[PDB]
Symmetry: C5
Subunit: 366 residues, 5 copies
Amino acid sequence: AELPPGRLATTEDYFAQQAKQAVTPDVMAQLAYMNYIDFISPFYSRGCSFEAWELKHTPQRVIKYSIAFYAYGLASVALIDPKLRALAGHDLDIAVSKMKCKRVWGDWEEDGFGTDPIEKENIMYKGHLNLMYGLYQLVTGSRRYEAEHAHLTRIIHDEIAANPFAGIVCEPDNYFVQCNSVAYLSLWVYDRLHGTDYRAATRAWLDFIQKDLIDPERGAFYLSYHPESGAVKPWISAYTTAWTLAMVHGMDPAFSERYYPRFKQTFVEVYDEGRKARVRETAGTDDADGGVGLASAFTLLLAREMGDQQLFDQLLNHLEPPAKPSIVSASLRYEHPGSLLFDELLFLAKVHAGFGALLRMPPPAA
Amino acid sequence: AELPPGRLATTEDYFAQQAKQAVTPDVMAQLAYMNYIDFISPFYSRGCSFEAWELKHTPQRVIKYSIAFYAYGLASVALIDPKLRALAGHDLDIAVSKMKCKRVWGDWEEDGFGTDPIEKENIMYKGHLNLMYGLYQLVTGSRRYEAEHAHLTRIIHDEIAANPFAGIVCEPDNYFVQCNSVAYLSLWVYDRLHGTDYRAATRAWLDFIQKDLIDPERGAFYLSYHPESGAVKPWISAYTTAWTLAMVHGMDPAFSERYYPRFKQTFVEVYDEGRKARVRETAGTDDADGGVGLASAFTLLLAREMGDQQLFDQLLNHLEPPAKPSIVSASLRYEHPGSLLFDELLFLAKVHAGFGALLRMPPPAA
Amino acid sequence: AELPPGRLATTEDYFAQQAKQAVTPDVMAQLAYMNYIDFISPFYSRGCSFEAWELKHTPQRVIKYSIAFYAYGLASVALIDPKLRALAGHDLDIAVSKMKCKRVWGDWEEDGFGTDPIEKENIMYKGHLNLMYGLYQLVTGSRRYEAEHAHLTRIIHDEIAANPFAGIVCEPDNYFVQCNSVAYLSLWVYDRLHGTDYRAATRAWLDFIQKDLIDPERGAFYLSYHPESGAVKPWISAYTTAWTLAMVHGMDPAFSERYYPRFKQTFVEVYDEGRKARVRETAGTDDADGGVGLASAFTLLLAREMGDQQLFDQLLNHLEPPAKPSIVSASLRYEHPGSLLFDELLFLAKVHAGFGALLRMPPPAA
Amino acid sequence: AELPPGRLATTEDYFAQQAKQAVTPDVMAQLAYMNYIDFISPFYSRGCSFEAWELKHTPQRVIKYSIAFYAYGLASVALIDPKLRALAGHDLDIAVSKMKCKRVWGDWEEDGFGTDPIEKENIMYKGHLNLMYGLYQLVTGSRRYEAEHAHLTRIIHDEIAANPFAGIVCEPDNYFVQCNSVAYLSLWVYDRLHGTDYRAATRAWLDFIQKDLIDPERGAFYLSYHPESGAVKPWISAYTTAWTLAMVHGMDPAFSERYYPRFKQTFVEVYDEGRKARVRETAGTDDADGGVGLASAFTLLLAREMGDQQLFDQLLNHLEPPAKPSIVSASLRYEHPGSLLFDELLFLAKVHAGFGALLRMPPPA
Amino acid sequence: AELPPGRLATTEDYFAQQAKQAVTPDVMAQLAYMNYIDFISPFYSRGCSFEAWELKHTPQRVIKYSIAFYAYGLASVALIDPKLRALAGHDLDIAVSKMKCKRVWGDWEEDGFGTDPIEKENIMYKGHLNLMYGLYQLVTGSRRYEAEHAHLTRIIHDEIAANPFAGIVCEPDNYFVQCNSVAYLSLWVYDRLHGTDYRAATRAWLDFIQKDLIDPERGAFYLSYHPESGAVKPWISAYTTAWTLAMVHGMDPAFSERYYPRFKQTFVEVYDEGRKARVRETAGTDDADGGVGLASAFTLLLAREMGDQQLFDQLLNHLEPPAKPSIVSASLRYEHPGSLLFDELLFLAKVHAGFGALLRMPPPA
């Protein structure tokens, strides 16, 4: 219809991008922020320079997630506009390269866990890296990283097969359903590119997480599981659940469709006479966006994945105007980003074509 | 029954937790602060990351005590609620793992005393670690640290046996009763897990400390003893005495029952028409909480250990309201912590089941 | 023939310098800034001291360009006034020497690209160095850098020869037309000095960049090209185009004469009743000098190259007055430089004799 | 007169401590500052941690003097109260240990003079260390550092024996009478402890310094002497003279008694209707406490040594109130110390029993 | 005797010091600043400590000149008052030692020129060091540095003999006439001390700088010369010229007497009804003391060297009062030093006995 005060385009416009085979003008301006200025734009160089993240005060531990969410958005841009597919592929190439720099993964070694960030555990880093390898090849058709993708995929597969519980831990003795969801999605992508059936393990993982790691009544996952002590931390998490449901919807749509209504009841607050919405991070509080501060932003991605245009509009009306977007020299900027990973996640939500459609992305024109 | 101004829960409610088999909501919110947010909560990871302490400005020398006092509080959480015992055990695993990081023990080397922090002396560090080894095993039933526990317990026992005075020194030539008190309690915990009689050394230690290291009429220990010169520092200390009497009460309850009312006469100032109290750190002053600033907070622990609900309420009415507690997103914060180790010591005193009860904690049956 | 506030000499006087065989007094005052004060002037010593650049807050990635644009201006100074030819030669010797300091090229290593900055790729650096080598020898008698010049020229020639596309990438997988224009110009200088035909490769390059790297109708180059993915970034760039058209005019005057009118219509905004002009950096914006902020400054150099006295006057009337020039002790300073590389590019544009003229520099004495 | 605002006890009270065999409450409060709080009190640990000096902004070159002046005061505390003698001995042990930390002597190496701070010259460090070895043993009777004390005493005496002038230098070619006085005093302490006669060299030194190095009419020493060039710097120094006469008074009382009245006439300004005094650092100025800023504080020590209760009272009335003392949790603090080494030198002057008395200290137990 | 507001002594008084055999009280207070306070005075120690310069914010590249200009001043102090000659000699000993510290010469290595600061070129450092060696021995009669002096003098001689132009460069391919003047003056001093004729190379050097490097009508040298390109930088420089003419006056007084009036016409602006003067650094400007900001300060030295009392008084009336000199505890301080090397150059100019007089300095005996 029409756009609220501090909004750049309507929700109708974002949802129509694929049908119209073109990104909106503000999505183009975000692509310009990512690509345009020498040395300081985030996708300027495959080198290990991180000036763009320094300029944004990205904490070191968060750089790997920023790169990953940029990559996931780029993959949908490729699906939206055939004429931007080469550009998206080039940016994905750079994302894989930067992801492998020690600035990005070195917290593993500084925390004392080892010098090799892919060898075992650390799925929080290598789950994303493996998915990125795969999306890069889907987009470009390039075998640049094929040997690396095969090696990391088998490593992930072997870890899963050898655990008594379904899945893999991130750090030693810490298990997170959201990092597992990335890892399993990368198996689906590998199976798409090659003959394989790495995805066969997904069934046992979906059955396992619905047992003790989820509150089926509230449609919400608990914070984390700890296999050695058997502990499940007793708080439910909105950002955890929105992220997980979104990726799971790409592999088993019925699963996410079952819990999504109950999820909204549990965490989502509609206000401003139906015009806006904000998301509580855990139960037993009125406060929105507590904890890591990302409940609302990940629910925006979930709403987009589930095709919920109403909730999408309500969340973006809450999230974007107070941040004060402007476009300068055809480039997107925010004066007051409201959270970590802010331009990254709003970019992803505006373009996201569904993790299922990424799995079914047609071959490049060659 | 009435909630005093500025307080989160009644003293009646804290003391009733174990009987009702549930922590209070503000204790649960302290557990949330300890466990909830990725990367920056203190018990997120077993790696050598200390962001949580950095954000609270904890002095390096104080981190070992922070971790230890959290661990003692978690052991009581395990007794209070069977459903939180797995989480308490997980947190204790992380505590032991963090305790061994060089950030925690490295002052020993930097001061020029040696490269190995458990080898000889340095009881202030290895006393707490040995007790944490034993508490972890009592909570979880896990033998993960058992070889390390055996090794350190024998080091402690051997050192005691070799010394012509009863006990062990901290720094070379510096002897503190409170650090010894931790070391001996760890001997009792070892004997409880195994068949042993290591605790037999306790009687000679208790004889020695009542001879020149205490003023028996004031129920107060002197600051320190220095074996080589024979010197005893001629100032008495409240935080020293409160800590020591609380731990000793778990090994020889009659000892502590004897001195406790004298200690209160010597140091405790009741004010505001009996509603509040604060604790003087040494004799011959009117000033409260001088020196390291922890007389009141350790006396809060001692009041809990001794079953003194009247003094517990008075001290907590003095300590907590001016720190401005609030619960945001189901997690506890203080705007103005009044001392070092503030959330640690309030957490520990609110849940503390008594050191005797910890020593005799039943197995995780069900 | 009149002078607005903040201008130091007329556009007529700048364009007449060569015919008068004398620099303007403000150009002499700029040469004083470059040469006068012990230790802190930029051309005081061949050593690796960069105090002059620290005092101007030059980012280290930009120092190589600062040095190169000084060098290109000095070459025209040698052509303008024979009495300053020896000084200009001395300054060029120092430029080459400083250009080889690790402070200048070391970003290549820190980004992780290698320890040798001329081995392969890195044309953004070694292209400028190779041109500097040649201009030095044209201006002076000297064969000081002759072996280095021959060696690098070969490296560039071989790298062009082995590439499937016309030209050379900067960093890996990143192709920029403006950095290539520098490299190709250096081949023409080498041929001029010796008997060679390295320049024969120019035709293919010019045919190639006119295919997909340029919008023919708008007279504007796209930001960059990336051979591995085949991507051309979809934004056109003014500073890119102005710099490239300026250098190509020295090799194929017809090439640049074809696109110049369209370039001006695309990017240049005339304002203040025809007295001023400023340049938009890309399409679809009204903002001037976005991006790296050098569209106007490089268009100033292009106007000089193309002999466009009206546009030159308009651009200098926009750029110089707000920067507040002053001449103190016969040395030029600016209170408010409006961009990076500010005194470097205004110096170059004021003296620039034309890149074709520099190729045709009459030989020095014996 | 009455006890003025920023004073803590009367001068009569400080001078009567030893008769009464008890320190005053504010002296006890200073010992509490020195000993009480974990990790950050100066005498908490024999380790090479210097957090107490970091908190006071002590320049590194000054830490060696801080530790030594503490040690000289601790020695008198042992003489004053037999019940604090074991504490004083413990603090002296820690003082010797910290004194040997590279944080303390490392300037010798950084300045480029060599890696070993005791083998030659550098009397400014090793003179104090040697005197502290000896005071520790007089206080405790412990033989812990006896071999080191024997080693360093022989080094120092050999150096004296080999020089054409009487004494030793600090830096190469810089000779200071105050650093020499410390070295010679430590020879007397060694003789008191053992059978020896190292002090026999004192007469040639006292003879020598009464020639070129002192202005006998003004009762004041010149800044320094430099043997290779023969140069004697032509300015007189009050802090130099006050420290030197205090220590020499313990070896040759007549020497200091001769020059003390001239010294006072030369440097001391009484003001505020006889209630206060402040000391000019050099001649030809009206300014008090110029130079290193320590004239008044060392003259406070010298007054105590000479038994001049009136000048001691006047100087302490000048020095202590503007520094704003208070006692908090039974520990002494100053909000605005007016010089380097401030709580150190006020501590020393309050307790100082006389260097001759220290020399004659009765065995412990 | 009439004395302007922020002046401490009259020009008549400065020019009379040698005949009266005594320095003025403000010159004595400057020596007090140089020598008095422990650790932080510049001439406290022969070690490689540079606290005095850190406190004054001296740029590292400038420290070699500060030490050198202090040394040249100390040499005149020795000639002025026999009673301060020992002190001046002691201070020169320290100057030579500190000069050899890596903090002083290390810019040579950092710029990438090499690890040995004396073997070739770098006359800007080693010419000063060589002159300092000689002045030390003239003042003291000590042969402490004689072998180093002989060695460096030979190095300089051989480098001159091997060059196709008259003289030596500083940095590679940078020739400066002022730095040459120091080096040639050092050959005269060596000749004075020993039997030799190193100075014979001087005539060819004066012939060369007069032919190519000075504008004889303006009595002013060009900024620099660059042998490999042949470039002479086309600006004339006042501080360059003043420094060079002062030192040349000691070797060929006729040379400097020829250009001095023309130099004053070119650069020196007399103002305030003839009471003051200030010096323009280059031609075609009205700005005073541009560039390195030292034109007036070096012209003050030159006026002293040439005996020009009137111009000396004018320049000091321009330079000293806005810096606000005062005397505190018998030591000289300025609130607002107006340039680099400020107290160094005003010191030097106040005492300077003439470079020829320094060469003829009688033995101490």
